[PDB]
């Protein structure tokens, strides 16, 4: 016999009971968060009063990923064996292995089954993920003579170590990135640092804007390098910046033609 444990992951800027079906009251549900569920029955029952969440050498009961609604369901046996081979009430520990971008991981928590279930026979848990402050930056490419904005200019970004920015999805895979401001938070991307040739190219949109959010801090200096220059212009100088939530303009001078 098993119970269903429904994990629901909401983000925050109370311990809710397992019998409570809580909608988050407007807080956003967090999709794409990975969990491993360890069967820690042997570890708890080796000495209950001493248990403090070790999953050392504990078998894995389950894995998965929160969905569009922040949810992850699993059917878990209400009983399982202890180290001495004796049947006990099962204990399961939840371990977040991959948070959502912009969020701290949640604390490992655990519970005994069978647990107190809500009206629908399910046991509801609600790990707290606290939002960590991240920073962003926008740039607006313009024509240095006309001061009009400029579409189609391509840029890469480098750090203090000479490594360039590549965005990936939650699992580290390549993604294809288009023009404009890139919402890393909403797409659950990651910032990685690689060789120039593997870098992600950012590109001014029809309003000249490009950039991203999802920076870890606002103290590191980064550099925007123009790598694709619109025809008829001269490269702007490299632009040092901080991820400080500001917008600033980058000027392309129209190249001069003499007779």
Author numbering: 39 to 51, 57 to 302
Extract from the study:
As the first reported host of “non-pathogenic-derived” pili, Lactobacillus rhamnosus GG is a gut-adapted commensal lactic acid bacterium (LAB) and one of many clinically investigated probiotic strains for human use in the prevention and treatment of certain gastric ailments. As with other Gram-positive bacteria, sortase-dependent piliation in L. rhamnosus GG (called SpaCBA) is assembled from the ~30 kDa SpaA (backbone), ~20 kDa SpaB (basal), and ~90 kDa SpaC (tip-located) pilins. Two immunoglobulin (Ig)-like subdomains comprise GG-SpaA, each having the conserved residues of a canonical E-box motif and internal isopeptide bonds formed between either lysine and asparagine or lysine and aspartate residues. Our findings show that the GG-SpaA structure has certain features in common with other pathogen-derived pilin-proteins, such as the Ig-like CnaB-type folds and the presence of internal isopeptide bonds6940.
Included in these experiments was also a related third mutant, in which the aspartate that forms the isopeptide bond in the C-domain was substituted with an asparagine (i.e., D295N), the residue that is normally found in Gram-positive backbone pilins. D295N-substituted GG-SpaA crystallizes in the same space group as the full-length WT protein and the E139A and E269A mutants, though with different cell dimensions. Six molecules in the asymmetric unit were visible, where the N-domain of one molecule is facing the C-domain of an adjacent molecule as in full-length WT. The overall topology of the D295N crystal structure is similar to that of WT GG-SpaA (RMSD of 0.8 Å), with maximum structural deviations found at the AB loop. Here, a protein band (~30 kDa) representing WT and D295N-mutated GG-SpaA was seen to be present throughout the 24 hours of trypsinization, although trace amounts of a smaller ~16 kDa-sized band began to be detected following 3 hours of incubation, with the levels then continuing to increase over time. Here, a first and second Tm for both the WT and D295N proteins was observed at around 52 and 66 °C, respectively.
